[PDB]
């Protein structure tokens, strides 16, 4: 689970916060990335920590 600003960061050839320190994909990667919004299930009014 990531934030909405960094969904496009899950791609071959990306740098920053998620792609450099958390989850890096190879340059010659073959496969599919499936992302969808989960604001109903993974959010709380007090703040999901």
């Amino acid at each position: 689970v990531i934030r909405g600003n960094e969904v496009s960061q899950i791609a071959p050839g990306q740098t920053g916060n998620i792609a450099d320190y958390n989850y890096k994909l190879p340059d010659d990667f073959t496969g599919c990335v499936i992302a969808w919004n989960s604001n109903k299930l993974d959010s709380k009014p007090s703040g999901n920590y």
Partner: protein, 50 residues
Amino acid sequence: YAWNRKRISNCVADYSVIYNFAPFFAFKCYGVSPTKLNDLCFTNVYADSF
């Protein structure tokens, strides 16, 4: 029709706080890429808001 232009100069620009300041999706650039903006540098930056 009366868009405001702000001149940015004589400073150090960090582009990683743009995602923190505003809740957008795509940082859509044309002559550059979003991930390489912190390495090289420019003369002047203008901001146009409407």
